[PDB]
Design a protein around this ligand. Structure first.
Ligand SMILES: *[C@@]12=NC3=[C]C([C])=C([C])[C]=C3N([C][C]([O])[C]([O])[C]([O])[C]OP([O])([O])=O)C1=NC(=O)[N]C2=O
Length: 108
């Protein structure tokens, strides 16, 4: 459906974003000069459920996939509901090299 896609670099200790689709920039209001190099958590805000955030934190430290419903905020401060699925991408030696994210605005 209508979705956006990013790639995070697991070879760096805090999974910075290294690629983002045109949709991600158009959806969030942020340019590449403010997204690339940074961890995705900047989209979070006051009403983001810390329990759900922690489901992602654990799934990333454990190298598993994960799906969560998060409240995110565009650059202009307005909120929206981000259905987010993170998938680990391993090398042949079983080590996680990248994390890929599909984000869907499910505000409906
Ligand atoms: C974010 N999308 C997103 C995409 C990928 C590929 C990854 C790996 C993470 C995200 N996040 C979350 C963020 O990077 C982090 O994993 C979590 O905040 C949990 O860890 P912390 O240390 O912050 O407790 C995404 N977060 C969002 O809020 N919106 C997304 O689109």
């Amino acid at each position: 459906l209508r979705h956006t896609f990013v790639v995070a670099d697991a070879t760096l200790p805090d999974c910075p974003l290294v690629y983002a689709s045109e949709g991600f920039y158009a959806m969030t209001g942020y340019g590449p000069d403010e997204v690339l190099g940074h961890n995705c958590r900047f989209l979070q805000g006051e009403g983001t459920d810390p329990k759900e955030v922690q489901k992602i934190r654990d799934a990333i430290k454990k190298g598993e996939a994960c799906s969560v419903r998060l409240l995110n905020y565009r650059k202009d401060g307005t909120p929206f509901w981000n259905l987010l699925t993170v998938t680990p991408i391993k090398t042949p030696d079983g080590r996680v090299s990248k994390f890929v994210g599909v984000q869907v605005d499910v505000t409906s």
